[PDB]
Amino acid sequence: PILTQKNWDGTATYFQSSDEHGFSMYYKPQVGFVGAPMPFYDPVAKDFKVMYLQDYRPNPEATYHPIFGVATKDGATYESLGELISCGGRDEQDAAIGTGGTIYNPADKLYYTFYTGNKFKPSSDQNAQVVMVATSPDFKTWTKNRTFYLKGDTYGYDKNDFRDPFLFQTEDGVYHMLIATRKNGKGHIAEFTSADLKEWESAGTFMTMMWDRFYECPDVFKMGDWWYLIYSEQASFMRKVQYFKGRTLEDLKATTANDAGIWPDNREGMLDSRAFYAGKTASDGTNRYIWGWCPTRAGNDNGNVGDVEPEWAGNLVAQRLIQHEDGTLTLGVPDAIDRKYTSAQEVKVMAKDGNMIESGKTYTLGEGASVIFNRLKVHNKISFTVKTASNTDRFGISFVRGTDSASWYSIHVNADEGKANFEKDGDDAKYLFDNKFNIPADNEYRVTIYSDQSVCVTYINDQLSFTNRIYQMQKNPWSLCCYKGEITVSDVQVSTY
Amino acid sequence: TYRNEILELPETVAANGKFGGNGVKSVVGHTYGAQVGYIADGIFKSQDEVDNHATQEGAAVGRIRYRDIDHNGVIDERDQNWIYDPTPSFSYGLNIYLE
Amino acid sequence: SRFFDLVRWGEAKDVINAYYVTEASRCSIYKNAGFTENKNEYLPVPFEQISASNGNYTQNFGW
Amino acid sequence: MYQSKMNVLNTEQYGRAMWQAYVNDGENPNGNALGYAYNWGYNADGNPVL
Amino acid sequence: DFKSGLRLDGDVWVNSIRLDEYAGTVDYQNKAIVVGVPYDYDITRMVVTEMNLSEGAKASIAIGETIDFSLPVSLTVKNGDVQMSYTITVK
Ligand SMILES: OC[C@H]1O[C@@](CO)(OC[C@H]2O[C@@](CO)(OC[C@H]3O[C@@](CO)(OC[C@H]4O[C@@](CO)(OC[C@H]5O[C@](O)(CO)[C@@H](O)[C@@H]5O)[C@@H](O)[C@@H]4O)[C@@H](O)[C@@H]3O)[C@@H](O)[C@@H]2O)[C@@H](O)[C@@H]1O
Numbered sequence: 001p002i003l004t005q006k007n008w009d010g011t012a013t014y015f016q017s018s019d020e021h022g023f024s025m026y027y028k029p030q031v032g033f034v035g036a037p038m039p040f041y042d043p044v045a046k047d048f049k050v051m052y053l054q055d056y057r058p059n060p061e062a063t064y065h066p067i068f069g070v071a072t073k074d075g076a077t078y079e080s081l082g083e084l085i086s087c088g089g090r091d092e093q094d095a096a097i098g099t100g101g102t103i104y105n106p107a108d109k110l111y112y113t114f115y116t117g118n119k120f121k122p123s124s125d126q127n128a129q130v131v132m133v134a135t136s137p138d139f140k141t142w143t144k145n146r147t148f149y150l151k152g153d154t155y156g157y158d159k160n161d162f163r164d165p166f167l168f169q170t171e172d173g174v175y176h177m178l179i180a181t182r183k184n185g186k187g188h189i190a191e192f193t194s195a196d197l198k199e200w201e202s203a204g205t206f207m208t209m210m211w212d213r214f215y216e217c218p219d220v221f222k223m224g225d226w227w228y229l230i231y232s233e234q235a236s237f238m239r240k241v242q243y244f245k246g247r248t249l250e251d252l253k254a255t256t257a258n259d260a261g262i263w264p265d266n267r268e269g270m271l272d273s274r275a276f277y278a279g280k281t282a283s284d285g286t287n288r289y290i291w292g293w294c295p296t297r298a299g300n301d302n303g304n305v306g307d308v309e310p311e312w313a314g315n316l317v318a319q320r321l322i323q324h325e326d327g328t329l330t331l332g333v334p335d336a337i338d339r340k341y342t343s344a345q346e347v348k349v350m351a352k353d354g355n356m357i358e359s360g361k362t363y364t365l366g367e368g369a370s371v372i373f374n375r376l377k378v379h380n381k382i383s384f385t386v387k388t389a390s391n392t393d394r395f396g397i398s399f400v401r402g403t404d405s406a407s408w409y410s411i412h413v414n415a416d417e418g419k420a421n422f423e424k425d426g427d428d429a430k431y432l433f434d435n436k437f438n439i440p441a442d443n444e445y446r447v448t449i450y451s452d453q454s455v456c457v458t459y460i461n462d463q464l465s466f467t468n469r470i471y472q473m474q475k476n477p478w479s480l481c482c483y484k485g486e487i488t489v490s491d492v493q494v495s496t497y
Numbered sequence: 498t499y500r501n502e503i504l505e506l507p508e509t510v511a512a513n514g515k516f517g518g519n520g521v522k523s524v525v526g527h528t529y530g531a532q533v534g535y536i537a538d539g540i541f542k543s544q545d546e547v548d549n550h551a552t553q554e555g556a557a558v559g560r561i562r563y564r565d566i567d568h569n570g571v572i573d574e575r576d577q578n579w580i581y582d583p584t585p586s587f588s589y590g591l592n593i594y595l596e
Numbered sequence: 597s598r599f600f601d602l603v604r605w606g607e608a609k610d611v612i613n614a615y616y617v618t619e620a621s622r623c624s625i626y627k628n629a630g631f632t633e634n635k636n637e638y639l640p641v642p643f644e645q646i647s648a649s650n651g652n653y654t655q656n657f658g659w
Numbered sequence: 660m661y662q663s664k665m666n667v668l669n670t671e672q673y674g675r676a677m678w679q680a681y682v683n684d685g686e687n688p689n690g691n692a693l694g695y696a697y698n699w700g701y702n703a704d705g706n707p708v709l
Numbered sequence: 710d711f712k713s714g715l716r717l718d719g720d721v722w723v724n725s726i727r728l729d730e731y732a733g734t735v736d737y738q739n740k741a742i743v744v745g746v747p748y749d750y751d752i753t754r755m756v757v758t759e760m761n762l763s764e765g766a767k768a769s770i771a772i773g774e775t776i777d778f779s780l781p782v783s784l785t786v787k788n789g790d791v792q793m794s795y796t797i798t799v800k
């Protein structure tokens with residue numbers, strides 16, 4: 001049997017691609033999906049051991065969401081350590097395991113993982129969520145402490161809202177646990193102090209939430225000279241990841257103490273759009289990496305974002321935290337991910353629909369003009385530079401773009417609105433969501449898209465990070481378009497591996 | 498050795514394929530009991546191979562690849578041919594008696 | 597009678613596609629399901645019958 | 660005497676085949692609901708192993 | 710060499726619950742072990758003293774460890790590769 005190879009390079013016709021069950025760069029196990037990442041830095045192995053919850057499409061009704069461990073060292077390569085902590089019985093309090101934290105004790109050479117057990121169909125007198133602990137001697141085998149049950153209602157907190165234990169050790173030598181719970185109708189991040197991680201004292205309330213919202217997966221850390229609190233908003237209308245800044249821990253606590261609204265920056269602490277959730281950070285001592293999950297779309301439709309809140313779990317995504325001189329935080333591509341792309345692919349124009357002109361590597365586009373490039377591959381890195389006429393232009397990058405493509409999915413960088421918008425173009429012209437960022441004063445944009453199969457992350461001049469789930473984007477042409485202003489694109493480079 | 502061939506047949510019999518053809522093609526002009534089916538050109542070993550092959554329902558990695566007989570670009574009913582012939586090339590026998 | 601009612605009303609394609617999209621989340625059987633606008637709302641005339649009555653039976657539209 | 664004894668999977672082979680089918684399809688093998696509990700993981704390349 | 714190394718021919722049973730200084734009943738149909746205590750009991754600290762099983766049977770719960778019994782507790786008995794799961798509850 002002689003195999004036939006189609007002319008992939010030379011055609012711009014839309015092609016029905018498919019996603020493999022496994023992912024390499026943005027990790028996804030061959031079985032199940034990643035949810036709620038729990039990063040951790042191993043002081044012994046000097047690597048990153050990120051755990052998560054193994055979600056499935058047909059989740060069992062009672063017991064589900066086990067914990068699976070993933071070892072990495074750079075954020076690009078990932079190996080799987082298998083199931084670490086298994087879900088309990090139907091009647092056990094830990095039938096479903098929620099997000100947790102991990103901390104190493106040199107005192108007894110033990111890894112302690114504090115997770116949240118969810119009672120299946122809890123009764124009136126039964127706490128819905130209880131914090132539990134599992135100990136490991138070598139991070140491989142885990143034994144759950146059956147004598148530890150940190151009930152939320154013991155300290156006057158809500159029974160049904162007691163989640164996300166985050167553990168951190170300060171310089172004074174005492175470990176602090178933050179729990180995102182509810183008190184008398186108000187969202188409170190409560191602090192528990194310990195000296196041996198076996199007995200805890202509730203040291204009041206660490207912080208209060210902003211405008212009766214809920215914070216998911218709190219993460220307090222220190223980056224040089226500021227204290228940062230990364231959290232995920234549980235509100236259906238927001239469903240995003242924000243952060244708070246503070247020179248000291250006291251200043252961070254005083255931030256939003258009572259409807260203060262001390263936003264860290266002018267974009268209300270935005271980091272990424274709707275396609276990034278449960279962002280939790282870990283540092284190896286030289287760099288800080290945040291892990292989250294890009295959600296999947298029901299029916300494999302990029303425009304089917306879904307009502308209220310999107311689908312749970314998805315692909316593990318790792319980004320690098322960048323701290324500016326003013327204390328603001330921005331997300332950047334990991335160095336290993338950037339350097340993994342080695343081979344370079346020649347790029348050439350496919351379609352000439354607009355009034356654009358070509359002068360070599362430079363393409364000048366007016367309003368209503370667009371240019372279509374050649375096909376992409378499974379893993380793509382598209383880097384280019386766009387100079388706009390002024391600070392009120394609307395250019396855009398469109399994927400799943402073909403000669404006969406009825407609809408394509410676009411990211412429009414609107415300088416007049418000062419943000420970017422992920423929308424669906426074509427016969428539907430549907431608006432999906434957006435993300436605010438800082439507009440450069442020189443009208444210069446350095447656009448770098450890193451795409452693995454169907455998950456793509458766009459970086460704009462180290463100021464905007466935009467995660468997207470775009471199915472069928474691999475092995476399909478991509479295009480640049482302009483709608484209102486005048487743009488000039490250059491240095492277009494496509495790298496694959 | 499022998500060769501069998503059907504020369505005429507009622508239209509309903511040829512359609513229902515009781516004597517051969519599986520109800521897809523008429524057995525007239527072919528051996529009695531001959532069957533019509535697809536052609537399996539190995540199995541898919543990579544997503545690149547799956548994409549390169551002509552589109553077909555349920556194609557995936559590790560699945561049977563079916564040849565496109567008419568080169569229409571899609572695997573369907575018309576991509577079937579004569580694959581079975583229940584006629585031996587030759588049948589032989591040997592008897593040895595030593596006293 | 598639900599499918600026949602949908603076909604008679606003419607909204608069968610839209611209703612079936614919406615049902616597939618909605619139920620693909622809770623059922624993996626509908627992962628590759630898809631309804632064609634002018635083909636799948638009627639069963640095709642059997643190929644055996646068409647062959648038996650040569651030049652007399654015409655297949656339904658879209659098949 | 661019976662010579663053409665058809666070779667069929669024993670208990671362990673049947674469990675291994677079921678696990679392989681489940682992991683190939685991407686479903687959770689432990690959800691087989693046939694009384695089989697599988698201890699399994701991933702290798703360096705990500706291919707499941709039992 | 711047709712035989713497979715499964716050693717399935719092994720009996721797995723639990724026939725003794727001795728939580729602290731209390732006994733209990735065992736129902737094999739529902740895989741349940743129910744232990745009765747007075748209305749006032751600490752339950753948050755129970756030690757297992759006598760948990761004999763079938764010959765060669767190993768259980769996840771050992772002797773001398775303490776377990777909070779505010780909620781039903783799952784126990785797994787595994788003599789070889791044959792496993793059986795029970796649930797222990799305290800009234
Ligand atoms: O399993 C059924 C179906 O729904 C999911 C959605 O995740 O599972 C629900 C199940 O997941 C748990 C732990 O397994 O929490 C999910 C983990 O992810 C977090 C974010 O870090 O929560 C986000 C997730 O929580 C949702 C829906 O579950 O709302 C939480 C829900 O909990 C209440 O208390 C119910 O009484 C309410 O506050 C609220 O309605 C939703 O807002 C988000 O999508 C973490 O909080 C958590 O660790 C359990 O909390 C939950 O029962 C899917 O896995 C599955 O398809």
Ligand SMILES: [Mg+2]
Binds near residue numbers: 565566567572573575
């Ligand atoms: Mg064909």
